[PDB]
Coordinates of C-alpha atoms in Angstrom, one line a residue:
Chain A
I1 CA 3.8 17.2 -22.0
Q2 CA 0.8 16.7 -20.5
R3 CA -1.6 13.3 -19.7
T4 CA -4.4 13.0 -18.1
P5 CA -5.0 11.5 -14.7
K6 CA -6.0 8.0 -13.6
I7 CA -8.2 7.3 -11.1
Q8 CA -9.6 5.0 -9.2
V9 CA -12.1 5.8 -5.5
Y10 CA -12.3 2.4 -3.5
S11 CA -12.1 2.2 0.0
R12 CA -9.0 1.1 2.4
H13 CA -10.5 -1.7 3.4
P14 CA -14.0 -4.0 2.5
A15 CA -16.9 -2.3 3.3
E16 CA -18.9 -3.5 5.9
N17 CA -21.8 -0.5 6.4
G18 CA -21.6 0.6 9.9
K19 CA -17.7 0.2 10.3
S20 CA -15.5 3.0 10.1
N21 CA -13.1 2.5 6.9
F22 CA -11.5 5.3 4.8
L23 CA -12.4 6.7 1.7
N24 CA -9.1 6.5 -1.2
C25 CA -9.3 8.8 -4.3
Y26 CA -6.1 7.8 -5.5
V27 CA -4.7 9.4 -9.0
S28 CA -1.8 8.6 -10.8
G29 CA -0.3 8.9 -14.5
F30 CA -0.8 12.9 -14.7
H31 CA 1.5 16.3 -16.1
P32 CA 1.9 18.6 -14.7
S33 CA 1.3 18.3 -10.9
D34 CA -1.7 20.7 -10.0
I35 CA -4.3 19.1 -9.6
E36 CA -7.8 19.4 -7.7
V37 CA -9.1 16.6 -6.1
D38 CA -12.1 16.1 -4.3
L39 CA -14.3 13.5 -2.0
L40 CA -18.1 13.9 -2.3
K41 CA -20.7 12.2 0.3
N42 CA -24.0 12.6 -2.0
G43 CA -22.2 15.0 -4.1
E44 CA -21.1 17.4 -1.3
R45 CA -18.3 18.1 -0.8
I46 CA -15.9 16.5 2.5
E47 CA -14.3 19.4 4.5
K48 CA -11.0 17.1 5.9
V49 CA -9.6 15.7 3.2
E50 CA -5.7 14.8 3.4
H51 CA -3.3 13.8 0.8
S52 CA 0.0 12.0 0.7
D53 CA 3.1 13.9 -0.5
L54 CA 3.7 14.6 -4.2
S55 CA 5.7 11.9 -5.5
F56 CA 6.5 10.5 -9.1
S57 CA 7.0 7.2 -11.1
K58 CA 9.7 6.3 -13.2
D59 CA 7.9 7.5 -16.4
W60 CA 8.0 11.2 -14.8
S61 CA 4.2 10.8 -14.1
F62 CA 2.8 11.9 -11.3
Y63 CA 0.4 10.0 -8.0
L64 CA -1.9 11.5 -5.1
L65 CA -3.7 9.3 -3.2
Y66 CA -6.6 11.2 -1.5
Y67 CA -8.2 10.3 1.8
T68 CA -10.7 10.3 4.6
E69 CA -12.4 8.5 6.9
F70 CA -15.5 7.2 6.3
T71 CA -18.4 4.5 7.6
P72 CA -20.0 3.4 5.0
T73 CA -23.9 2.9 4.8
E74 CA -26.8 1.3 2.1
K75 CA -27.9 4.7 1.7
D76 CA -24.6 7.1 1.4
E77 CA -23.2 7.7 -2.3
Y78 CA -19.6 8.9 -2.2
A79 CA -17.7 9.9 -5.1
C80 CA -14.0 11.4 -6.5
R81 CA -14.1 15.0 -8.4
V82 CA -10.7 15.6 -10.0
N83 CA -10.0 18.4 -12.5
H84 CA -6.7 18.8 -14.2
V85 CA -5.4 21.5 -16.7
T86 CA -6.0 18.4 -19.3
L87 CA -10.2 18.0 -18.4
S88 CA -12.2 20.2 -20.5
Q89 CA -14.7 19.7 -16.7
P90 CA -14.5 17.9 -13.5
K91 CA -14.6 14.3 -13.8
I92 CA -16.5 12.4 -11.5
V93 CA -16.0 8.9 -10.1
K94 CA -18.5 7.4 -7.9
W95 CA -17.4 4.6 -5.5
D96 CA -18.7 1.4 -5.8
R97 CA -18.1 -1.3 -2.7
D98 CA -17.1 -4.5 -5.5
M99 CA -14.4 -2.3 -6.6
Chain B
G1 CA 16.7 -9.7 -1.6
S2 CA 17.9 -6.1 -3.7
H3 CA 16.9 -3.1 -2.0
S4 CA 16.6 0.4 -3.5
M5 CA 16.5 4.3 -1.7
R6 CA 15.4 6.7 -4.3
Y7 CA 14.4 11.0 -3.7
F8 CA 11.9 12.1 -5.8
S9 CA 12.2 16.4 -6.2
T10 CA 9.4 18.2 -8.4
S11 CA 10.0 22.0 -8.3
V12 CA 7.0 23.9 -10.1
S13 CA 7.3 27.7 -11.3
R14 CA 4.4 29.7 -10.6
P15 CA 4.6 33.1 -11.8
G16 CA 2.2 35.7 -9.8
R17 CA 2.3 33.3 -7.4
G18 CA 5.8 33.6 -5.7
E19 CA 8.8 31.2 -5.5
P20 CA 8.6 28.0 -6.9
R21 CA 7.1 25.3 -5.5
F22 CA 9.2 22.6 -4.2
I23 CA 8.7 19.0 -2.9
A24 CA 11.0 16.3 -2.1
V25 CA 10.5 12.8 -0.9
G26 CA 12.4 10.0 0.1
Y27 CA 11.6 6.4 -0.4
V28 CA 13.2 2.6 1.1
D29 CA 11.7 0.1 -1.9
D30 CA 7.9 0.7 -2.1
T31 CA 8.3 2.7 1.7
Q32 CA 8.2 6.8 2.0
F33 CA 10.6 7.9 4.8
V34 CA 10.9 11.9 4.7
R35 CA 9.4 14.7 3.2
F36 CA 10.4 18.6 2.5
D37 CA 8.0 21.0 1.4
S38 CA 9.0 24.3 0.5
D39 CA 5.6 25.9 1.3
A40 CA 5.1 24.2 4.5
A41 CA 5.5 26.2 7.9
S42 CA 8.3 23.1 9.4
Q43 CA 11.0 24.3 7.3
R44 CA 12.4 20.9 7.7
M45 CA 13.0 17.6 7.0
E46 CA 10.4 15.4 8.5
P47 CA 10.1 12.2 9.4
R48 CA 7.2 9.9 7.6
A49 CA 8.2 6.4 9.1
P50 CA 8.3 5.2 12.2
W51 CA 12.2 3.7 12.0
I52 CA 13.6 6.9 10.7
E53 CA 12.4 9.0 13.9
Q54 CA 15.4 7.1 15.6
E55 CA 17.9 9.0 13.6
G56 CA 19.2 11.8 16.2
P57 CA 18.8 15.9 16.0
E58 CA 22.1 16.0 13.7
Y59 CA 20.5 14.3 11.4
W60 CA 17.7 16.4 10.7
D61 CA 20.1 18.9 10.6
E62 CA 21.5 18.0 8.2
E63 CA 19.5 16.4 5.8
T64 CA 17.6 19.7 6.2
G65 CA 20.6 21.8 5.2
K66 CA 20.9 19.8 2.2
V67 CA 17.3 19.4 0.7
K68 CA 16.7 23.4 1.4
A69 CA 20.0 23.6 -1.0
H70 CA 19.0 21.6 -4.0
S71 CA 15.5 23.8 -3.7
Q72 CA 17.7 26.7 -4.1
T73 CA 19.6 25.1 -7.3
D74 CA 16.7 23.6 -8.9
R75 CA 14.8 26.8 -9.0
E76 CA 17.8 28.3 -10.7
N77 CA 17.9 25.3 -12.6
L78 CA 14.2 26.4 -14.0
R79 CA 15.5 29.7 -14.8
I80 CA 18.0 28.4 -16.8
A81 CA 15.6 26.3 -18.3
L82 CA 13.9 28.8 -19.7
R83 CA 16.6 30.6 -21.6
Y84 CA 17.6 27.8 -23.2
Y85 CA 14.1 26.3 -24.4
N86 CA 13.8 30.7 -24.8
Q87 CA 10.6 30.2 -23.3
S88 CA 8.5 33.0 -21.5
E89 CA 8.5 34.1 -17.9
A90 CA 4.8 34.4 -18.1
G91 CA 4.3 30.0 -18.1
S92 CA 5.1 27.4 -15.4
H93 CA 7.3 24.9 -15.4
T94 CA 8.8 21.4 -14.1
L95 CA 11.9 20.4 -13.1
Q96 CA 11.9 16.7 -11.5
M97 CA 14.7 14.9 -10.1
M98 CA 14.8 11.4 -8.8
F99 CA 18.0 10.0 -7.7
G100 CA 19.4 7.1 -4.8
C101 CA 21.6 3.8 -5.5
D102 CA 20.5 -0.2 -5.5
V103 CA 21.8 -2.9 -3.4
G104 CA 22.1 -6.4 -3.9
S105 CA 21.1 -9.1 -1.1
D106 CA 24.8 -8.6 0.6
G107 CA 24.2 -5.1 1.3
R108 CA 26.9 -4.2 -1.4
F109 CA 26.5 -1.1 -3.9
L110 CA 24.6 -2.5 -7.1
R111 CA 23.2 0.7 -9.4
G112 CA 23.7 4.3 -8.8
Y113 CA 20.6 6.8 -10.9
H114 CA 21.1 10.8 -11.1
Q115 CA 18.3 11.8 -13.5
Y116 CA 16.0 14.9 -14.1
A117 CA 13.1 15.6 -16.3
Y118 CA 11.8 19.2 -17.6
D119 CA 8.1 19.1 -18.2
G120 CA 7.6 15.8 -18.0
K121 CA 10.5 14.5 -20.6
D122 CA 14.0 13.9 -20.4
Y123 CA 16.3 16.1 -19.8
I124 CA 20.0 14.8 -18.3
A125 CA 20.6 11.5 -16.9
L126 CA 23.7 9.8 -15.3
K127 CA 24.4 7.1 -17.3
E128 CA 25.3 3.1 -15.6
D129 CA 28.9 3.8 -15.4
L130 CA 28.5 6.6 -13.8
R131 CA 30.7 8.4 -16.0
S132 CA 29.1 9.3 -18.8
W133 CA 25.3 11.3 -19.0
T134 CA 22.7 10.8 -22.2
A135 CA 21.4 14.6 -22.9
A136 CA 17.3 14.1 -25.0
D137 CA 17.5 17.7 -26.6
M138 CA 19.9 20.4 -27.8
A139 CA 19.7 22.1 -24.0
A140 CA 20.4 19.0 -22.3
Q141 CA 23.8 19.3 -24.6
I142 CA 24.6 22.2 -23.6
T143 CA 24.6 21.2 -19.8
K144 CA 26.4 17.5 -20.5
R145 CA 28.7 19.5 -22.0
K146 CA 29.0 21.7 -18.9
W147 CA 28.7 18.5 -16.4
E148 CA 31.9 16.5 -18.7
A149 CA 34.1 19.7 -18.3
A150 CA 33.3 20.1 -14.5
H151 CA 33.4 16.1 -13.7
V152 CA 29.8 16.7 -12.2
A153 CA 29.4 12.7 -13.0
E154 CA 32.5 12.0 -10.6
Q155 CA 31.3 14.0 -7.7
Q156 CA 28.1 12.2 -8.0
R157 CA 30.0 9.2 -7.6
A158 CA 31.1 9.0 -4.1
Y159 CA 27.7 9.6 -2.9
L160 CA 25.9 7.1 -5.4
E161 CA 28.8 4.3 -4.1
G162 CA 29.2 5.2 -0.6
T163 CA 26.8 7.6 1.2
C164 CA 24.0 5.8 -0.7
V165 CA 24.5 2.7 0.4
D166 CA 26.1 3.6 3.8
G167 CA 22.5 4.9 4.5
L168 CA 20.5 2.9 2.4
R169 CA 22.0 -0.3 4.8
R170 CA 21.4 1.8 8.1
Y171 CA 18.3 2.2 7.3
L172 CA 17.7 -1.3 6.3
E173 CA 18.8 -2.1 9.8
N174 CA 17.0 -0.2 11.3
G175 CA 14.0 -0.3 9.9
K176 CA 14.3 -4.1 9.2
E177 CA 10.9 -5.4 10.8
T178 CA 8.8 -4.0 7.7
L179 CA 11.5 -3.3 5.6
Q180 CA 13.0 -6.8 5.8
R181 CA 9.6 -8.4 6.2
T182 CA 6.6 -9.1 4.1
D183 CA 2.9 -8.8 4.3
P184 CA 1.0 -11.4 2.1
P185 CA -1.8 -10.7 0.2
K186 CA -4.8 -11.4 2.0
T187 CA -7.3 -12.8 -0.6
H188 CA -10.9 -14.0 -1.7
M189 CA -13.2 -14.4 -4.8
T190 CA -16.6 -12.6 -5.4
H191 CA -19.3 -13.4 -7.6
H192 CA -21.5 -10.8 -9.7
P193 CA -24.3 -12.0 -12.0
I194 CA -24.6 -9.8 -14.4
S195 CA -27.0 -10.9 -16.9
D196 CA -28.9 -14.3 -17.3
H197 CA -25.9 -15.3 -18.8
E198 CA -23.3 -14.0 -17.6
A199 CA -21.5 -13.4 -14.7
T200 CA -18.1 -11.4 -14.0
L201 CA -15.8 -13.2 -10.8
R202 CA -13.1 -10.7 -9.1
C203 CA -10.1 -12.2 -7.3
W204 CA -9.1 -10.1 -4.9
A205 CA -5.3 -9.2 -3.0
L206 CA -5.3 -7.0 -0.2
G207 CA -2.8 -5.3 2.0
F208 CA -0.1 -7.1 0.8
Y209 CA 3.9 -5.4 0.9
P210 CA 5.6 -4.6 -1.1
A211 CA 3.5 -3.9 -4.1
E212 CA 5.2 -6.1 -6.6
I213 CA 2.5 -9.0 -7.5
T214 CA 0.9 -10.9 -10.2
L215 CA -2.5 -11.8 -10.7
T216 CA -3.4 -13.8 -13.3
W217 CA -6.7 -16.2 -14.4
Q218 CA -6.8 -19.2 -15.9
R219 CA -9.6 -21.7 -18.1
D220 CA -9.7 -25.0 -17.3
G221 CA -5.5 -25.0 -16.6
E222 CA -4.7 -22.2 -19.7
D223 CA -4.0 -18.7 -19.6
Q224 CA -7.3 -16.6 -19.9
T225 CA -6.8 -13.4 -20.7
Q226 CA -10.0 -12.2 -22.8
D227 CA -13.1 -10.7 -21.2
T228 CA -10.5 -9.6 -18.2
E229 CA -9.6 -6.8 -16.2
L230 CA -6.7 -6.4 -14.0
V231 CA -6.8 -2.8 -12.4
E232 CA -3.8 -0.9 -11.2
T233 CA -1.8 -2.0 -8.3
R234 CA -2.5 0.7 -5.5
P235 CA -2.3 1.9 -2.1
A236 CA -4.6 1.0 0.7
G237 CA -3.0 3.7 2.2
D238 CA -1.8 2.6 5.8
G239 CA 1.7 1.4 4.1
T240 CA 0.5 -1.6 2.1
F241 CA -1.5 -2.3 -1.3
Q242 CA -4.7 -3.7 -3.0
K243 CA -5.3 -5.2 -6.5
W244 CA -7.5 -7.4 -8.4
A245 CA -8.3 -9.2 -10.7
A246 CA -12.1 -9.9 -12.9
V247 CA -13.3 -12.4 -15.7
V248 CA -16.7 -12.4 -16.8
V249 CA -17.6 -15.7 -17.5
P250 CA -20.4 -17.9 -18.7
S251 CA -23.2 -18.8 -16.4
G252 CA -22.5 -22.3 -15.0
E253 CA -18.8 -22.4 -15.8
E254 CA -17.3 -20.3 -13.1
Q255 CA -15.8 -24.1 -12.1
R256 CA -13.1 -23.7 -15.1
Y257 CA -11.7 -20.3 -13.4
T258 CA -9.2 -20.1 -11.7
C259 CA -7.3 -17.2 -9.7
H260 CA -3.6 -17.3 -9.0
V261 CA -1.6 -14.5 -6.8
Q262 CA 2.1 -14.6 -6.9
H263 CA 3.7 -12.8 -4.1
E264 CA 7.3 -12.1 -2.5
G265 CA 5.0 -13.1 1.1
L266 CA 3.6 -16.3 -0.1
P267 CA 5.7 -19.3 -0.2
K268 CA 3.4 -21.2 -2.4
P269 CA 1.9 -19.2 -5.3
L270 CA -2.1 -19.1 -4.1
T271 CA -4.8 -20.9 -6.3
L272 CA -8.3 -19.4 -5.7
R273 CA -11.5 -21.6 -7.5
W274 CA -14.9 -20.1 -6.9
Chain C
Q1 CA 20.8 10.1 3.3
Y2 CA 20.4 13.0 0.7
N3 CA 23.2 14.0 -1.4
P4 CA 23.5 17.7 -1.6
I5 CA 22.8 19.1 -4.8
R6 CA 24.4 22.4 -5.9
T7 CA 25.7 21.7 -9.9
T8 CA 23.6 24.4 -12.4
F9 CA 22.9 23.8 -15.9

């Protein structure tokens, strides 16, 4: 079986410029478990990203949380870049502080 | 007032890149408390919640031995499954296991689980009576017949009805300041004009534990599901969870709409209006 | 508390 990842990009806490926070990319509902997830700042790969321990849901599909500390600004753009065998090319999802 | 303990393992073969990778995690309710990763330097079961750090050295030795043995067993099971399904050694495959128990408010046994999935599909599962198996395809029936013959189910019952329940009871007491408490959702509503004629109301629930929550909209006090969007519950990353529910409304009618929040940490459900 | 898993398919 193969299932494509669902992706949510969001902050740990409500964004306010100049305040430390965490940028999260939650990938879920995918199979198999091999997956590539990058966090992007202005299109560039953020170097110190951590992730949760591989786990799965009752339907056996996998989920992982990727995260990094960040201080949002008015200017800076953030995103999550996901690749998986189900995808023909990496998927980029932009961070929107209202979602 | 029920509680659960679960162990989840994933074994992935990777021909050309060494022996299969094995990762196991343990949870009480929605709280992760241990991990083991075959690829990590530690080669130990490791704590992942404060309240398990109380366990002594013997615990970490014993748990480490048990999870390592499981890793080697499911490596052999990946090899066996390849033979049962007549699959090439060139390919990568996945064997997942889940096992654990549920207890009631009184701490006594309610349900046990012991089950596997191969390449994302059910393989074999112990049935609720803890004496019979559900086998999903002709390969799993070979295993089912072997396990019936060898009384494997009976062997798991002492663990599921005994050790599992006993461990969960101890963890619930030692970790009670989180595991037997709740974080109610922090809530608020935002307003987004999206056109001259429409606006989006978004109802936020943040920092709640456990993860179970219900967010619904009403219009004039009757359920509203048209033109709504509800995101899947998602981890904040700090042990708590997030969710939101949004509705598109005609500009000027915002006051007709209410958001309703139900959560174990709320004595009374909340009603939010713009 | 883990259950030692030793049973093969």
